[PDB]
Symmetry: C2
Subunit: 131 residues, 2 copies
């Protein structure tokens, strides 16, 4: 919906490194990924949704449809299968690969976009705001 | 194949503006798109191919499989249907939207990657080289 559409700047991050350790990201790459403050750009054209994050080195983007499974190569190079849904006003994305799975939840909170990444027990919280 | 895999820097461009005029890109956007020298990063993971171009403002990326049609939102904001194939050592991509269609051909030439965009009569040539 039009609730997520826009450009966002990151403002906070919590327990991100432990979330990364849990998914198996390499030391040099976690250390790197945590030193940057990405921008999240979300838009929609018809029934097609787009999310792209800019960074001073790593830049990615995904184009998908709700409730339709697709193939994704993450920023950290994992070949996963994604399925994104609209569960009660929140964009719920589930990535699954090699028997494991993680869930990324995007939801509005006033003038902020709250993102919560979870990997069996560990949760990281990143708060965004418009730009 | 492993022939296109790598990072590329642009070195030349020819008749690009006329190619843009033909596809209907807006004046301010063509003027902008031509002042930048993008980088093309191509990689493969299993049967999944990835092409992403970096620029000091506009950054995009596509993930696809050969011979399988998919939905794409171009850098200039056109919602097109793409189909990419391997026609005799050349990556041939066809975009189609609103009764029209364009063809982008990527092929090797020594140590260069030659790209040729065509829109009924008009052809633009952009030459890349490794980085």
């Amino acid at each position: 919906g039009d609730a997520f559409v826009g450009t966002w700047k990151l403002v906070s991050s919590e327990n991100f490194d432990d979330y990364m350790k849990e998914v198996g990201v390499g030391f040099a790459t976690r250390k790197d990924a945590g030193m940057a403050k990405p921008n999240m750009i979300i838009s929609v054209n018809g029934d097609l949704v787009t999310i792209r994050s800019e960074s001073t080195h790593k830049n990615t983007e995904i184009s998908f449809k709700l409730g339709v499974e697709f193939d994704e190569i993450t920023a950290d190079d994992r070949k996963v299968k994604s399925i994104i849904t609209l569960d009660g006003g929140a964009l719920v994305q589930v990535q699954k690969w090699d028997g494991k799975s993680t869930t990324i939840k995007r939801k509005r909170d006033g003038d902020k976009l709250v993102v919560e990444c979870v990997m069996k027990g560990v949760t990281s919280t990143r708060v965004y705001e418009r730009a």
